[PDB]
Amino acid sequence: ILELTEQEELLKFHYHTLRLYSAVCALGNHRVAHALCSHVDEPQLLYAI
Amino acid sequence: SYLLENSSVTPLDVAAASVMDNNELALALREPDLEKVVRYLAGCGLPVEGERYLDFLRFAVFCNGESVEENANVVVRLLIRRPEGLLAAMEEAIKIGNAIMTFYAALIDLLGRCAEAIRIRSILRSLGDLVGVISIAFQFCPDHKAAMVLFLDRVYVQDFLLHLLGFLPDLRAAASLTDMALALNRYLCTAVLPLLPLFAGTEHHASLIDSLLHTVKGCSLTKAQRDSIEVCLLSRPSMMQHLLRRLVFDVPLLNKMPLKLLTNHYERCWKYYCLPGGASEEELHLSRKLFWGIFDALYEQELFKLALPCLSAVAGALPPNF
Amino acid sequence: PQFLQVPSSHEHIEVTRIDVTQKSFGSQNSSTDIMFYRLSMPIECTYYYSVRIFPNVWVGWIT
Amino acid sequence: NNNGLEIGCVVGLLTFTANGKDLSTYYQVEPSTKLFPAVFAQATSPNVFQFEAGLFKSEHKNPVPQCPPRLHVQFLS
Amino acid sequence: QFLRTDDEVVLQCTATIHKEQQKLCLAAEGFGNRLCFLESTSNSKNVPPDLSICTFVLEQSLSVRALQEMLANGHRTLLYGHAILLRHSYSGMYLCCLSTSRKLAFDVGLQEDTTGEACWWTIHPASKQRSEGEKVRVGDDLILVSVSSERYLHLSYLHVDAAFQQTLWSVAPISSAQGYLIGGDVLRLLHGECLTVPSGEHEQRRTVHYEGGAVSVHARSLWRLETLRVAWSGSHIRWGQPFRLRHVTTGKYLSLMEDKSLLLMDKEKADVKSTAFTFRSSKEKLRKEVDGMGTSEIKYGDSVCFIQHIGTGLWLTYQSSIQRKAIMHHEGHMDDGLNLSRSQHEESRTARVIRSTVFLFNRFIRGLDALSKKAKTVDLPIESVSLSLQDLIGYFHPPDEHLEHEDKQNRLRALKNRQNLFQEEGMINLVLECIDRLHVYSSVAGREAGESWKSILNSLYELLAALIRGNRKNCAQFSGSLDWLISRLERLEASSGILEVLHCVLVESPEALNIIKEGHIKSIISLLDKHGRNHKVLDVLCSLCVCHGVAVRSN
């Protein structure tokens, strides 16, 4: 991802995924949110921080 | 204004001579006098009559080379209203009534001798037909095209410049020695107008050399030689050297003084071709070695050897009626 | 080296999206050297994929 | 000797039919991995290469009976 | 008596068509048309002229010399030798010389901005009677010459072009009191409830009805009061001077047909004593004309106005969902004194554009009907369509972020008013039918006209989106066609355009968020397999996920 600053079309799309993945968890979608922990992998987000 | 109203045919010649030379006088004239001229042109529906008017108006707006603007404006503005398609129906008349052919030549000259001053370009760009008459006068001949060129020059890049070029037919038909004899000397001053890819340019530089070979009349050839010195100064360098290769054949034929001055014109051109070269550069050192035989052959020669001094510096840049 | 689509800004090696399901390609230029026409989408593990040749060639199914 | 029709049919295994005629026993082996449809070229003419029993669109995409080969946008070069 | 700045006038000539000097005036449409044309005012009996798109307002009349300095950077009377500015009185477009042909004369158009010399036009008499500096009177035969091209505004043979031959453009005035009725004004017809006409796709919209409630907002309650005269049409509305009524949305004249009833009939059938009414203060049936703005007689707000037909003396009464049907009768009730109310200018500006949208796309529908059934050439407009199609997007352009707030709010308040008017006449449905007939082939027709087929379709949706982006109403009106859009979603041609409609709906229709089902959304996610990687899809899926503020968890 750190490279992908310059990959501009591909920068924009994946950002919108992050809106989308945060979307589908709209105020308590817990059955969804357990499923997304598999997709996005919380320690990766710890590294994203 | 007396004379204008009289002139229905000479009388209008008188009004012509009354104007031509003086700027001061040509400025001083007013517009309805010019309007009486063009209303007589409006009567011509069929001519021969109209050509004397447009000749007058030709000497109304140009007068010293500098197209006088206040005449040039108002003359034109009335002409749109009654001029009065017209290209191709003219093209019939060549093969046919000589006066119809000469008519539009003088009409286009009036417009040719004239150029907020941008809208007047546009109406003159509103009359395309350019190359059409250029194609005609390659075939009586000389007067029509020179008016078209002056129209083309003022109103209306190097690609389209080379597009126009049977000017080689003018230089080649020089050996027909009488309308064409008077044509060619008119197209020597017309040749100064093109002063302002590489393959078709080498044909035209050889066509300029064919006109120079017809030159190698006299003061017209001085206009052609000035057109020749500006042509080699305008230009690749090897195509200029291919033109200098056919000039080296003429340099062998040179060593009468006009061909030596054409070689003196190629000598400062060889000073320009030396910096591009620092093939036939060995034969160019042989042309300076033939100039050493020209040193063995010898006040005008001081100017000829000073050009050969440039050719001696040019040979060292390489050494660093059929 | 890596893959990237052909944009229209190129040496004019022309992609033409045509429908029965064909894409023609042109090389009317001063480029002859190397062309690697890899289409975008792979396979995993019946379905025949044809290549029409007017004029060498190396047809590849490449990971 | 003007037209050549070199066809790499799929499905796990591969076959080659060149000008509609079998030039098979090719390097046809993979248990479950990937293969790009590729034509490697040195540009010998223009109108040089035109591309296309089931059909290749029905294999790859999300619809998988999809037997008419309906082209998409992602068919890229 | 004179012509000054800010006076509505026309530009009238004559033409030798069959031994009669056809008294035609300058007409140019706007909002669909950039070019000029002719409108004959001769046959005012049977086919009366569309005087709305013929008038012009003298916005500024300055001399040639006092202009070029201003161009390098107050009811003033017109003098000959002044370059005037002729804004089109409807569309707000300034009359200009163009750079095209229709023939070495240029063309005459209505451009948008006053900068450039083409918008200005100098006046010179072709009359030795009057000369330069004299005050331009009413009805002077004059010549209009440009400033850029300096060509004459000429009547060619039957087209207007900037030429070098001259033409006498006779100037008849139209107008120059606020709160009082002025002829030419598009306006409503109140009761105490308003007069209406049937809705879209409904009869060919010919009946006449009283209706209360929210039809006063609509465009189908708009009525243009057209006088019989050409000159001084913007005279004040008196009791008893004649008026040809004409409905706005259909472009039909309100005519008394003795065969059926009071009906809306077209331009050609509407003879004067079959369609023209007058106004009475009482229900009695007791002047001819004045040349001026006239007596500022009748008010808009405070005026009980009875309506009487000229040829018969019938009165506009009603029969009796409130679809109270209005008819004509010799006596009627005491509820015929109908009050009036003006429309706003933007309200009139929309609805004339609505009938422009009508006549354009319906020819475009019928032309599409010709080349869909059989191949090989009924007149199918393309450029005229695409010119309007681009313009309506500009008509419905959202207000800029670089605009001041209150003006941005007004323009947005104007914008929704502009939007609501197209829905309630079925322009959305009219566009919807055009998207039907075009999405047939895949690039049939003449493919220089049918060459822009790709660019037409794109901007259709871009229109269709723009008529949604603000309103909660109109997106909820895509309750029906939302499944159809997902059906045409996988056309892969203008597939961003379908989505951009479908995006802006699903921002503002919590209604339609609950409509959408599995296989629709499946197809939307399937489209992402089609079109590579579009974040455009994702924000749609974001909007399918989140509502205005709440979640739709089943989605």
Coordinates of C-alpha atoms in Angstrom, one line a residue, chain E residues 60-522:
Chain E
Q60 CA -28.3 49.1 -24.1
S61 CA -28.1 51.6 -26.9
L62 CA -24.7 53.3 -27.1
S63 CA -22.8 54.7 -30.0
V64 CA -20.0 52.9 -31.8
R65 CA -17.3 55.1 -30.3
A66 CA -18.6 54.9 -26.7
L67 CA -18.4 51.1 -27.0
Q68 CA -15.0 50.0 -28.2
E69 CA -13.4 51.7 -25.2
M70 CA -15.8 49.8 -23.0
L71 CA -15.1 46.7 -25.0
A72 CA -11.4 47.3 -24.5
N73 CA -12.2 47.1 -20.8
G74 CA -31.1 55.2 -17.6
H75 CA -33.7 55.1 -20.4
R76 CA -31.3 56.5 -23.0
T77 CA -33.1 57.3 -26.2
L78 CA -32.0 55.4 -29.4
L79 CA -30.4 57.6 -32.0
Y80 CA -29.4 56.4 -35.4
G81 CA -25.8 55.5 -35.5
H82 CA -26.0 53.8 -32.1
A83 CA -25.0 50.1 -31.6
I84 CA -27.8 48.5 -29.7
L85 CA -28.0 45.3 -27.8
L86 CA -30.8 42.9 -28.6
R87 CA -31.4 40.5 -25.8
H88 CA -34.0 37.9 -26.6
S89 CA -36.8 38.7 -24.3
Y90 CA -37.5 35.1 -23.3
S91 CA -34.3 33.2 -23.3
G92 CA -32.1 36.1 -22.2
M93 CA -29.8 35.4 -25.2
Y94 CA -28.2 38.4 -27.0
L95 CA -28.5 38.7 -30.7
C96 CA -25.3 38.2 -32.5
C97 CA -23.6 37.5 -35.8
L98 CA -22.1 34.0 -36.0
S99 CA -19.1 32.5 -37.8
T100 CA -21.1 30.0 -39.9
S101 CA -22.9 29.8 -43.2
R102 CA -26.3 28.6 -44.2
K103 CA -23.4 32.1 -49.4
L104 CA -20.5 34.4 -48.1
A105 CA -22.8 36.0 -45.6
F106 CA -22.4 34.9 -42.0
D107 CA -25.2 33.6 -39.9
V108 CA -27.2 35.3 -37.2
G109 CA -27.5 33.8 -33.7
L110 CA -28.4 34.2 -30.1
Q111 CA -25.3 33.9 -28.0
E112 CA -25.0 34.0 -24.3
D113 CA -22.7 36.7 -23.2
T114 CA -22.6 40.4 -24.2
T115 CA -18.8 40.5 -24.6
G116 CA -17.6 40.5 -28.2
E117 CA -18.5 42.8 -30.9
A118 CA -21.0 40.5 -32.5
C119 CA -23.7 41.1 -30.0
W120 CA -23.9 44.8 -30.9
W121 CA -25.8 46.1 -33.9
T122 CA -25.8 49.6 -35.3
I123 CA -28.8 51.4 -36.7
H124 CA -28.8 53.4 -39.9
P125 CA -31.9 54.6 -41.8
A126 CA -32.4 53.8 -45.4
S127 CA -34.3 57.0 -45.7
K128 CA -33.1 60.4 -46.8
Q129 CA -35.8 61.8 -44.5
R130 CA -34.1 61.0 -41.3
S131 CA -30.3 61.0 -40.6
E132 CA -27.8 60.4 -37.8
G133 CA -28.4 61.7 -34.3
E134 CA -32.2 61.9 -34.8
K135 CA -34.4 60.2 -32.2
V136 CA -35.6 56.8 -33.3
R137 CA -39.4 57.0 -33.5
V138 CA -41.9 54.3 -33.4
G139 CA -42.0 52.4 -36.6
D140 CA -39.1 53.5 -38.6
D141 CA -37.7 51.5 -41.5
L142 CA -34.2 50.9 -40.5
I143 CA -31.1 48.8 -41.3
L144 CA -29.2 46.8 -38.7
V145 CA -25.5 46.5 -39.2
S146 CA -23.1 44.5 -37.1
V147 CA -20.1 45.6 -35.3
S148 CA -17.8 42.6 -35.6
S149 CA -18.5 41.5 -39.1
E150 CA -20.2 44.8 -39.9
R151 CA -22.6 43.0 -42.1
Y152 CA -26.3 43.8 -42.6
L153 CA -29.0 41.9 -40.8
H154 CA -30.5 40.6 -44.0
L155 CA -33.6 38.7 -45.1
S156 CA -32.2 36.1 -47.6
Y157 CA -34.2 33.7 -49.8
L158 CA -36.3 32.3 -46.5
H159 CA -33.6 32.7 -43.9
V160 CA -31.9 35.4 -41.8
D161 CA -28.2 36.0 -42.4
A162 CA -25.7 38.7 -41.8
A163 CA -25.2 39.9 -45.4
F164 CA -24.1 42.8 -47.5
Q165 CA -27.4 43.7 -49.0
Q166 CA -29.7 45.7 -46.7
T167 CA -33.2 45.1 -45.5
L168 CA -35.7 47.4 -43.8
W169 CA -36.4 46.2 -40.3
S170 CA -39.5 47.9 -39.1
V171 CA -39.6 48.1 -35.4
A172 CA -43.0 47.7 -33.7
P173 CA -43.0 48.3 -30.0
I174 CA -44.4 46.0 -27.4
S175 CA -43.9 47.6 -23.9
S176 CA -41.7 49.7 -21.6
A177 CA -46.8 49.6 -14.2
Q178 CA -45.8 47.0 -11.6
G179 CA -48.7 45.1 -10.0
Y180 CA -51.1 45.7 -12.9
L181 CA -51.9 43.3 -15.7
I182 CA -49.7 43.5 -18.8
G183 CA -50.4 41.6 -22.0
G184 CA -48.1 38.9 -22.9
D185 CA -47.7 37.7 -19.3
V186 CA -48.0 34.0 -18.6
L187 CA -50.2 33.7 -15.6
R188 CA -52.6 31.5 -13.6
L189 CA -56.4 31.7 -13.2
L190 CA -57.5 31.6 -9.5
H191 CA -61.0 30.9 -8.1
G192 CA -61.1 31.3 -4.3
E193 CA -58.6 26.8 -6.6
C194 CA -57.3 27.3 -10.1
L195 CA -58.0 26.4 -13.7
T196 CA -56.1 23.4 -14.9
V197 CA -55.5 21.0 -17.9
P198 CA -55.0 17.3 -17.7
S199 CA -51.6 15.8 -16.7
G200 CA -49.0 14.1 -18.7
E201 CA -49.8 11.1 -21.0
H202 CA -53.4 11.8 -20.7
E203 CA -57.2 13.0 -24.6
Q204 CA -54.1 14.7 -25.9
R205 CA -54.4 17.0 -22.8
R206 CA -57.4 18.9 -24.3
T207 CA -60.0 19.2 -21.5
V208 CA -60.5 22.2 -19.2
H209 CA -60.9 21.9 -15.4
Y210 CA -61.1 23.8 -12.1
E211 CA -58.9 22.3 -9.5
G212 CA -57.8 23.3 -6.0
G213 CA -54.7 22.5 -4.2
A214 CA -51.3 21.7 -5.7
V215 CA -51.9 22.4 -9.3
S216 CA -51.3 26.2 -8.8
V217 CA -47.7 25.2 -8.4
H218 CA -47.9 23.2 -11.6
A219 CA -47.1 24.3 -15.1
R220 CA -50.4 23.1 -16.4
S221 CA -52.1 25.9 -14.7
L222 CA -50.3 28.5 -16.7
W223 CA -52.0 30.6 -19.4
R224 CA -50.4 33.1 -21.8
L225 CA -52.5 36.2 -22.7
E226 CA -51.7 36.9 -26.3
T227 CA -53.3 40.0 -27.9
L228 CA -54.5 40.2 -31.4
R229 CA -52.1 43.0 -32.3
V230 CA -48.4 42.6 -33.2
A231 CA -47.4 46.0 -31.9
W232 CA -48.0 47.0 -28.3
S233 CA -48.6 43.5 -27.1
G234 CA -47.4 44.6 -23.7
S235 CA -50.2 47.1 -23.4
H236 CA -51.9 46.9 -20.1
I237 CA -54.8 44.5 -19.9
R238 CA -58.1 46.5 -20.2
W239 CA -61.6 45.3 -19.8
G240 CA -62.8 44.2 -23.1
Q241 CA -59.8 44.4 -25.4
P242 CA -59.3 40.9 -27.1
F243 CA -57.1 38.1 -26.0
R244 CA -56.2 34.8 -27.7
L245 CA -55.7 32.4 -24.7
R246 CA -53.1 29.8 -25.2
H247 CA -52.1 27.0 -22.9
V248 CA -48.5 26.8 -22.1
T249 CA -47.5 23.2 -21.7
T250 CA -49.3 21.8 -24.7
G251 CA -48.7 24.9 -26.8
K252 CA -52.4 24.9 -27.7
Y253 CA -54.9 27.7 -27.9
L254 CA -58.0 27.6 -25.7
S255 CA -60.8 27.5 -28.2
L256 CA -64.6 27.4 -28.1
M257 CA -65.6 24.6 -30.4
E258 CA -69.4 24.5 -31.0
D259 CA -69.2 20.8 -32.0
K260 CA -68.1 19.6 -28.5
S261 CA -67.2 22.2 -25.9
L262 CA -64.5 24.6 -24.7
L263 CA -61.3 22.8 -25.8
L264 CA -57.5 23.2 -26.3
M265 CA -56.8 23.2 -30.0
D266 CA -53.5 23.9 -31.9
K267 CA -52.1 26.9 -33.7
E268 CA -53.8 26.1 -37.0
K269 CA -57.4 25.3 -36.1
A270 CA -57.7 28.3 -33.7
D271 CA -59.5 31.0 -35.6
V272 CA -59.9 34.3 -33.7
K273 CA -63.6 34.3 -32.9
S274 CA -63.4 30.6 -32.0
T275 CA -60.6 31.1 -29.4
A276 CA -60.3 34.8 -28.3
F277 CA -61.9 35.9 -25.0
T278 CA -62.2 39.1 -23.1
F279 CA -62.6 40.1 -19.5
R280 CA -65.7 41.7 -17.9
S281 CA -66.0 43.2 -14.4
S282 CA -69.7 42.2 -14.0
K283 CA -71.5 39.5 -16.1
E284 CA -72.7 42.1 -18.6
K285 CA -72.1 42.2 -22.3
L286 CA -71.9 45.9 -23.1
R287 CA -63.0 50.4 -26.8
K288 CA -61.3 49.1 -29.9
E289 CA -57.5 49.9 -29.4
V290 CA -54.9 52.3 -28.0
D291 CA -51.3 52.4 -29.2
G292 CA -49.1 52.6 -26.1
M293 CA -48.9 50.8 -22.7
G294 CA -52.5 51.9 -22.4
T295 CA -54.7 52.2 -19.3
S296 CA -53.1 50.4 -16.4
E297 CA -56.4 48.8 -15.7
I298 CA -56.7 45.5 -14.0
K299 CA -54.8 44.2 -11.1
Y300 CA -53.2 40.8 -10.6
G301 CA -54.0 40.1 -6.9
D302 CA -57.2 42.2 -6.2
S303 CA -59.3 41.6 -9.4
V304 CA -62.5 39.6 -9.7
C305 CA -62.6 38.9 -13.4
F306 CA -65.4 37.4 -15.3
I307 CA -64.5 35.7 -18.6
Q308 CA -66.5 36.0 -21.7
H309 CA -66.1 34.6 -25.2
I310 CA -66.2 37.3 -28.0
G311 CA -68.0 35.5 -30.8
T312 CA -70.9 34.0 -28.7
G313 CA -71.0 35.7 -25.2
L314 CA -70.6 32.4 -23.3
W315 CA -69.2 32.5 -19.7
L316 CA -66.5 30.3 -18.1
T317 CA -68.5 28.2 -15.7
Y318 CA -68.0 24.8 -14.2
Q319 CA -69.6 21.3 -13.9
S320 CA -68.8 19.1 -10.9
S321 CA -61.6 13.4 -6.8
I322 CA -62.0 17.1 -7.5
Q323 CA -61.7 17.3 -11.3
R324 CA -64.4 20.1 -11.4
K325 CA -64.8 20.4 -15.2
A326 CA -64.9 24.0 -16.5
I327 CA -67.1 24.7 -19.6
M328 CA -68.7 27.6 -21.5
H329 CA -72.4 28.7 -21.0
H330 CA -74.6 31.8 -21.6
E331 CA -75.2 32.4 -17.9
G332 CA -73.2 30.1 -15.6
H333 CA -73.0 30.7 -11.8
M334 CA -71.9 33.6 -9.6
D335 CA -68.6 31.7 -9.3
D336 CA -67.2 32.8 -12.7
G337 CA -65.5 36.0 -11.4
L338 CA -62.1 34.3 -11.5
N339 CA -59.3 36.1 -9.7
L340 CA -55.8 36.2 -11.4
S341 CA -52.2 35.7 -10.3
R342 CA -49.0 36.2 -12.2
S343 CA -46.4 33.6 -12.6
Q344 CA -42.8 34.4 -11.8
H345 CA -40.4 34.8 -14.7
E346 CA -38.6 31.6 -13.9
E347 CA -42.0 29.9 -13.7
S348 CA -42.7 31.1 -17.2
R349 CA -39.1 30.2 -18.2
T350 CA -39.5 26.7 -17.2
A351 CA -42.7 26.0 -18.9
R352 CA -42.0 27.4 -22.2
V353 CA -38.9 25.1 -22.1
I354 CA -41.2 22.3 -21.2
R355 CA -43.1 22.7 -24.5
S356 CA -39.7 22.9 -26.2
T357 CA -38.8 19.6 -24.6
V358 CA -42.1 18.3 -25.8
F359 CA -41.9 19.2 -29.5
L360 CA -38.3 18.1 -29.7
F361 CA -38.4 14.7 -28.2
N362 CA -41.7 13.7 -29.8
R363 CA -40.2 14.3 -33.2
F364 CA -37.2 12.4 -31.9
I365 CA -39.5 9.6 -30.8
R366 CA -41.4 9.4 -34.1
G367 CA -38.1 9.6 -36.0
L368 CA -36.8 6.7 -33.8
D369 CA -40.1 4.9 -34.6
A370 CA -39.3 5.2 -38.3
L371 CA -35.8 3.7 -38.3
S372 CA -36.6 1.0 -35.7
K373 CA -39.4 -0.7 -37.7
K374 CA -38.1 -0.5 -41.3
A375 CA -34.6 0.6 -42.4
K376 CA -34.1 3.2 -45.2
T377 CA -35.9 8.6 -43.8
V378 CA -38.4 10.6 -41.7
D379 CA -36.7 13.7 -40.2
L380 CA -34.8 12.7 -37.2
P381 CA -33.1 15.6 -35.4
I382 CA -29.7 15.0 -33.8
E383 CA -27.9 18.2 -33.5
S384 CA -31.0 20.1 -32.5
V385 CA -31.6 17.4 -29.9
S386 CA -28.0 17.4 -28.6
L387 CA -27.9 21.1 -28.5
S388 CA -31.0 21.1 -26.2
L389 CA -29.7 18.1 -24.4
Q390 CA -26.5 19.9 -23.4
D391 CA -28.5 23.0 -22.6
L392 CA -30.9 21.4 -20.3
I393 CA -28.1 20.0 -18.3
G394 CA -26.9 23.5 -18.1
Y395 CA -30.4 24.5 -17.2
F396 CA -30.4 22.1 -14.4
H397 CA -26.9 22.7 -13.4
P398 CA -26.5 22.8 -9.6
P399 CA -25.4 25.9 -8.0
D400 CA -21.7 26.5 -7.5
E401 CA -19.9 26.1 -4.3
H402 CA -18.1 29.3 -5.3
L403 CA -21.3 31.2 -4.9
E404 CA -22.6 33.2 -2.1
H405 CA -24.8 31.4 0.2
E406 CA -28.0 33.2 0.1
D407 CA -27.8 33.4 -3.7
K408 CA -26.8 29.8 -3.7
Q409 CA -29.9 29.1 -1.7
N410 CA -32.0 31.0 -4.1
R411 CA -30.6 29.3 -7.1
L412 CA -31.2 26.0 -5.4
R413 CA -34.7 27.1 -4.5
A414 CA -35.0 28.0 -8.1
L415 CA -33.5 24.7 -9.1
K416 CA -36.0 22.5 -7.3
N417 CA -38.8 24.7 -8.7
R418 CA -37.2 24.0 -12.0
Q419 CA -37.1 20.3 -11.2
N420 CA -40.6 20.0 -9.9
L421 CA -42.0 21.3 -13.0
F422 CA -40.6 18.7 -15.3
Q423 CA -41.9 15.8 -13.2
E424 CA -45.4 17.2 -13.1
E425 CA -45.6 17.4 -16.8
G426 CA -43.9 14.1 -17.4
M427 CA -40.7 15.2 -18.9
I428 CA -39.0 12.6 -16.8
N429 CA -41.3 10.1 -18.4
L430 CA -40.7 11.7 -21.7
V431 CA -37.0 11.2 -21.3
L432 CA -37.7 7.7 -20.1
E433 CA -39.4 6.9 -23.4
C434 CA -36.5 8.2 -25.3
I435 CA -34.0 6.1 -23.5
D436 CA -36.3 3.2 -24.4
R437 CA -36.2 3.6 -28.1
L438 CA -32.5 4.5 -28.4
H439 CA -31.2 1.6 -26.4
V440 CA -32.0 -0.8 -29.2
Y441 CA -28.9 -1.3 -31.4
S442 CA -25.2 -0.9 -30.7
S443 CA -24.0 1.6 -33.4
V444 CA -29.3 1.4 -38.7
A445 CA -29.7 5.1 -39.2
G446 CA -27.5 7.6 -41.1
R447 CA -24.2 7.3 -39.2
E448 CA -23.2 10.8 -39.2
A449 CA -26.6 11.7 -37.6
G450 CA -26.4 8.3 -35.8
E451 CA -22.7 8.9 -35.1
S452 CA -23.4 10.9 -31.9
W453 CA -25.7 8.2 -30.6
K454 CA -23.1 7.4 -28.0
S455 CA -22.8 11.0 -26.9
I456 CA -26.6 11.4 -26.9
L457 CA -27.2 8.5 -24.6
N458 CA -24.6 9.6 -22.2
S459 CA -26.1 13.0 -21.7
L460 CA -29.6 11.7 -21.5
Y461 CA -28.8 10.0 -18.3
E462 CA -26.8 13.0 -17.3
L463 CA -29.9 15.0 -17.7
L464 CA -31.9 12.3 -16.0
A465 CA -29.7 12.4 -13.0
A466 CA -29.7 16.1 -12.8
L467 CA -33.5 16.1 -12.5
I468 CA -33.2 14.0 -9.4
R469 CA -30.2 15.2 -7.4
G470 CA -32.1 17.6 -5.2
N471 CA -35.6 16.3 -4.8
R472 CA -37.0 13.7 -2.5
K473 CA -40.0 13.5 -4.8
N474 CA -38.6 12.7 -8.1
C475 CA -36.3 10.0 -6.8
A476 CA -39.3 8.4 -5.2
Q477 CA -40.9 8.7 -8.7
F478 CA -38.2 6.2 -9.8
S479 CA -39.9 3.6 -7.7
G480 CA -41.1 2.1 -10.9
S481 CA -38.2 2.3 -13.3
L482 CA -35.5 1.4 -10.8
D483 CA -35.7 -2.3 -11.7
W484 CA -35.6 -1.2 -15.4
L485 CA -32.5 0.8 -14.9
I486 CA -30.8 -2.3 -13.3
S487 CA -32.1 -4.2 -16.3
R488 CA -30.4 -1.8 -18.7
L489 CA -27.4 -1.5 -16.3
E490 CA -25.7 -4.3 -18.1
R491 CA -25.7 -2.6 -21.5
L492 CA -22.0 -1.7 -20.9
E493 CA -22.4 1.3 -23.3
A494 CA -23.3 4.2 -21.1
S495 CA -23.1 2.1 -18.0
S496 CA -21.6 4.9 -15.9
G497 CA -24.7 7.0 -16.8
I498 CA -27.2 4.5 -15.6
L499 CA -25.3 4.3 -12.4
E500 CA -25.0 8.0 -11.9
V501 CA -28.7 8.2 -12.1
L502 CA -29.0 5.3 -9.8
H503 CA -26.5 6.9 -7.4
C504 CA -28.3 10.1 -6.9
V505 CA -31.6 8.4 -6.5
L506 CA -30.4 6.1 -3.8
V507 CA -28.9 9.0 -1.8
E508 CA -32.3 10.6 -1.6
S509 CA -35.0 7.9 -1.8
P510 CA -35.3 5.8 1.3
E511 CA -38.4 4.8 -0.5
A512 CA -36.4 3.1 -3.2
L513 CA -33.7 1.8 -1.0
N514 CA -36.2 -0.6 0.4
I515 CA -37.4 -1.6 -3.1
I516 CA -34.3 -3.1 -4.3
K517 CA -33.9 -6.9 -4.1
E518 CA -31.2 -9.6 -4.2
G519 CA -30.8 -10.2 -7.9
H520 CA -30.8 -6.4 -8.6
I521 CA -28.0 -5.8 -6.2
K522 CA -26.4 -9.0 -7.4

